[PDB]
């Protein structure tokens, strides 16, 4: 399985890990040269909550399997049962996780009140759908 | 309907040792990878060691490396966190995580025991 390419991780079962086997659809050959830092794995987008940095609804997200992320930068994360993508604001004991939408609106996370981990870092994009 | 439950903690000195237990009930436990993470006031939790289903691997933060291990046993139920050269950076909340391993890599659910504080001073 080592061999064949990135996992590409479709719909999660809430609470489940996301690379749990059940959640891998399939897989696919892509160059490790591609994304820096390395894709470990492809997370199939929902929604348009970053449609104005060009991550789409559909769109295969490479992520870099890390717990090191800073302030900026497009974070995978686990809040209670539900993950998300978005740019992380830490901010002491608040941490805010920023849409790339104006119709969307920032989710703000207590630390003292919910489970907020990080679950990697998104390095790039890959969309493929039979009508661009 | 997996429960969850940390023990062990308590009020430690730098360069001392303390043992962390957590008791997992409502799972097949033997087919989980199972972890520890902390949360340090107002900081965001992070993963502090992780084992495989039948621990074949493990994973550690890079800063309680040497110094943390984890270990399992599968007849009992239960994972463990063995700390060494406890520095005040250690001081946390510890929590229990269910998950499961993917080529080498820790990846955690949202299951949690209520935690077990650590505190480290002189």
């Known amino acids: 399985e080592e061999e064949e390419g990135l996992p590409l991780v479709g719909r999660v079962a809430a609470g489940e890990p996301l690379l749990a086997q059940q959640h891998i659809e399939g897989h696919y050959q892509v160059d490790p040269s591609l994304f820096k830092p390395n894709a470990d794995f492809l997370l199939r987008v929902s929604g348009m909550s970053m449609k104005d940095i060009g991550i789409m609804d559909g769109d295969l997200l490479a992520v870099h399997k890390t717990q090191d992320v800073r302030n900026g930068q497009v974070v995978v994360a686990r809040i209670d049962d539900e993950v998300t993508v978005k740019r992380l604001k830490k901010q002491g004991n608040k941490v805010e996780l920023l849409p790339e939408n104006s119709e969307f609106k920032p989710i703000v996370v207590d630390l003292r009140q919910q489970s907020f981990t990080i679950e990697g870092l998104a390095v790039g994009v890959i969309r493929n759908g039979d009508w661009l | 309907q997996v429960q969850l439950v940390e023990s062990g903690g308590g009020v430690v000195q730098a360069g001392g040792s303390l043992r962390l237990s957590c008791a997992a009930s409502?799972?097949?436990?033997?087919?989980?990878?199972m972890a520890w993470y902390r949360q340090a006031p107002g900081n965001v939790r992070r993963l502090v060691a992780a084992?495989?289903?039948?621990?074949?691997?493990?994973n550690y933060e890079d800063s309680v490396r040497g110094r943390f291990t984890i270990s399992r046993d599968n007849a009992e139920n239960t994972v463990s966190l063995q700390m060494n050269s406890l520095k005040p950076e250690d001081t946390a909340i510890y929590y229990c995580?269910?998950?499961?391993?993917?080529?080498?890599?820790?990846?955690?659910?949202?299951?949690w025991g209520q935690g077990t504080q650590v505190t480290v001073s002189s």
């Open positions: 084992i495989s289903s039948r621990g074949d691997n493990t």
């Open positions: 409502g799972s097949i436990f033997s087919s989980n990878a």
């Open positions: 995580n269910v998950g499961s391993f993917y080529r080498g890599n820790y990846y955690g659910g949202s299951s």
